[PDB]
Amino acid sequence: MAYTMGIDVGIASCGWAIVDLERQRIIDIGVRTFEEALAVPRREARSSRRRLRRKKHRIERLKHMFVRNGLAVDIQHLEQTLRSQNEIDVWQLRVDGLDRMLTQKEWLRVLIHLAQRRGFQSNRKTEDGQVLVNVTENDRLMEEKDYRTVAEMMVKDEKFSDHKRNKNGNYHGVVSRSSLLVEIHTLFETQRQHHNSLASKDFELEYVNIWSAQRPVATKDQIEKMIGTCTFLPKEKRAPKASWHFQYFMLLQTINHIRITNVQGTRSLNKEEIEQVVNMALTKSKVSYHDTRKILDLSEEYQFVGLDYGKEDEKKKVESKETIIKLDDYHKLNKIFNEVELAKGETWEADDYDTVAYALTFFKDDEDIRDYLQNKYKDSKNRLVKNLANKEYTNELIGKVSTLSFRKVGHLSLKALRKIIPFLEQGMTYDKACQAAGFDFQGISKKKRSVVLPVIDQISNPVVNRALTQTRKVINALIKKYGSPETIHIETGGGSGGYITKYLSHFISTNLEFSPSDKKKKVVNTSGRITSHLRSRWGLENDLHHAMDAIVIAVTSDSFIQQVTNYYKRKERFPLPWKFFREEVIARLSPNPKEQIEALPNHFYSEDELADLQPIFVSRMPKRSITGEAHQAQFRRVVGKTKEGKNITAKKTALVDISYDKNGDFNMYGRETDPATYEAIKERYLEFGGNVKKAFSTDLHKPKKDGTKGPLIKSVRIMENKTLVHPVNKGKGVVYNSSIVRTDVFQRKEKYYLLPVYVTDVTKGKLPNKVIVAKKGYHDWIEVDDSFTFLFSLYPNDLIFIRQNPKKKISLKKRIESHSISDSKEVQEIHAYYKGVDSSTAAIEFIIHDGSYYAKGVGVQNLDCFEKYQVDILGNYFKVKGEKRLELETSD
RNA sequence: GGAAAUUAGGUGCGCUUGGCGCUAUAGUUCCUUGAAAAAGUUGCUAUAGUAAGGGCGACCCGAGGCGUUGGGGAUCGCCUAGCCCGUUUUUACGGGCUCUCCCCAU
DNA sequence: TTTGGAAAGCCAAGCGCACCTAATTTCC
DNA sequence: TTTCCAAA
Ligand SMILES: [Cl-]
């Protein structure tokens, strides 16, 4: 009952092997699969929703004020007022308001318009992009041409003669926030000179306060919550790198670890030399190894350990190149401290440097910085948090230090650094200073080992988190079947930049109980190179190769690697784990394992071992979450219905993105109402070689009736057909579908029917109730009634079994096409992982267990059998006998 | 393999802003089709919508991940969960306890 | 029905933290 | 990657 576990872990799969190294037999093998980054669309959607909401609120706050300050009676009045007929362009009104009184209506439009877009405001703390160049250029245009305001620039300047708003993803019209504030103030001023009653200084101040309001990049404890904890004191936060304690610790560690070598040997610096290097670092901006040699007058027989001196030993060049210490944060803060006069007694102390470091590292807005440095910061639970100096600093200082930017933390808390530094000051190495302070420098886990792996610390990297948690489920399933392993051999694929390898090794080593044995490393990391050589040499050379690799990994120890090097040394003047190992591996990876094992000489497996023997069945992780993108993003117009009941949609499309045929024709909506534009585009496309980028890299004009040049043509509406759309914005647009949540399967008079359920259906009161009819519009799909029996719901990667009726077979297609005369396999029946449904055809798509074959467009209506199964972690599956059609109810 | 530091990078997660794109409507503009009624096209500007939908004014949630169980999953719960006890490994170690629902298994 | 495949919202300008790599050092 | 269209 002792075994070796082999594990092959990627970001999308865990191959595994149970091997008995004494019996010299493969016990059991398998594969668990779990197929931008995952959170990015969600994060971006979050940002978009907030931006739009905050803009709307700003306009709403302004409209509420306009009532209260007496520009209108109420909001109902205000809306009607402004939704009267606009005569003059609001940009022209913005310019007119500089030299004449604006009417109430004109003024209201101007104030709303100014609040739509607030311009660029840098948050930079440390090449210039297209936004910065345009902001700078626009600022220069206004300064040099004497434009009184942004609007005056935008109306009068040649740069904006064709458009004011930005087009085709350029940033020509982006201006500074400050220039728009100048405009607001100017217009309130000029309106007051021209006797506008609604331009009072009170109104001005409330307008600017509303217009200017914005949230800081971080508020309160937000940064503190992201900062990690001390390696030694895990309820402490990590210290800022800008703190004195961090910088002095780092300095002392560095100097104490210097080593110098001559022909005789290697030595450290003495206490006298250290003091000299330490004092130089505290006064000089940067220190090189050259400055270290110079301050100590160190003989040219000595070299510093760790430098590359090459052949020539051009010592000044090598040593001058290498900066050993640069206490930037210290010197920057020390300069600001020296601008601030102190009383005769007191001096700037370590706690002042730490306090300012904390303030600027843990907080980014001026309100939090100010409160903290005034010693009255309240955290997000209203609890006072005094600064480290317990000091209310002066407004002068707070103002001055807020010009600095600090960031980043070390691994250790301030408390830990306070205890360690005194021992580093006595010249100890880092490790011994830690010991002297009362800390185990390795922070070794004191925790008790466990029979199954405990839950994993949830980490923010969703791909790494999935891999580790799936690998845990595999290991724990295998422990619960076979008991504890003697060792675990692990290989990883490089897909997480080393995070999975480092995490997983340490986690298993620290937490898992191994079966009692003499073997030293409980966790053995094998190289892909060695694995790859053995597979080639053994001629063992899809999802099954992960299982193969898990076998090789399991039987790869260091003692076996020696036998390969012994062989290659001997051959210079091939090792197998056991007899028939190749043939056994091939047997265990095959569909007919029993037949292949029994074909080996001399009852290679016992009668028991053969009775237990199943073919490998790859286990695929279920995906049964009902959240997801609700529908596609772009809004479309419905312009008609096809004969077969599809929606005809249209959407404005840039000339470069239009789809043209051989003749340069395209599906332009309203072609009949614009032959000049239709013909101009087609003609332009044909002039060039159907090179769309070349053709549409210059302006195209619509010809006027007289034949001279009229307006530019940048896009037209293109028509396309779609069965299923959803209305948005009170039916003012439609949108297409995104991923299907689940497919509900029904039976009626021995035929099968499919009802796709979309994310938009989760908001409804009732489930959708129409099963697909191929090539017909939604109106002609069939309403479900008592004649249909509900069978089950299929999510992606649910397991199905189908049997085709006798008149035909299912054509499985090889995922990887080959030199074979046959790249398809036709089967009467199949167990397969469901992928989805084609709503135009009621035909499905699936993959066989290991992903090596698939089918697509398989109609279900006249199958002989259609059943649902479910798979466990290790590959066993179980028939679903009965399901209820579940309602769908998000908490949102 | 493990701790800390440095230099140069990488991946991910979170946040604040800016500007578009698309849709709808109004004006203006290029007009086109149509006997007419009408319908619609090009450019510019404005105003509105921009997950679907839900909860209470620098309002909030809403496309991600994980937990579970006899074995699995979630629309449930959580996102660095909660709540106790033991212990001088008291910033640690140990041991208790725990929502609703669906499928499978005995 | 099966097969082949087009389309899908996007970029600029920053503020942060976590984890990981390569090289270098002192250490268990 | 996924929906689902039009071609085969
Ligand atoms: Cl532009």
Residue numbers in the entry: 1 to 35, 44 to 134, 139 to 504, 664 to 712, 718 to 749, 758 to 1076
In the authors' words:
The RNA-guided DNA endonuclease Cas9 cleaves double-stranded DNA targets complementary to an RNA guide, and is widely used as a powerful genome-editing tool. Cas9 enzymes commonly adopt a bilobed architecture consisting of recognition (REC) and nuclease (NUC) lobes, with the guide RNA–target DNA heteroduplex accommodated within the positively charged central channel. Cas9 enzymes recognize the PAM nucleotides by the PI domain, and cleave the target and non-target strands using the HNH and RuvC domains, respectively. We confirmed that BlCas9 exhibits robust activity with an sgRNA with an optimal 22-nucleotide (nt) guide and recognizes N4CNDN PAMs with a pronounced preference for A at positions 7 and 8.
We thus crystallized a BlCas9-∆HNH variant, in which the HNH domain (residues 504–669) is replaced by a GGGSGG linker, as in the case of CjCas911. The sgRNA guide segment (G1–C20) and the target DNA strand (dG1–dC20) form the RNA–DNA heteroduplex, which is bound within the positively charged central channel between the REC and NUC lobes. Stem 1 (A67–G71 and C80–U84) and stem 2 (G74–A78 and U104–C108) form a triple-helix structure, which is stabilized by two base triples, G71:C80•C103 and U72•A78:U104. While the nucleobase of dA7* in the non-target strand is not recognized by the protein, the methyl group of dT(−7) in the target strand forms van der Waals interactions with Thr1025 and Ala1027, explaining the preference for A at position 7. Similarly, the dA8* nucleobase in the non-target strand does not contact the protein, whereas the O4 of dT(−8) forms a hydrogen bond with Lys959, consistent with the observed preference for A at position 8.
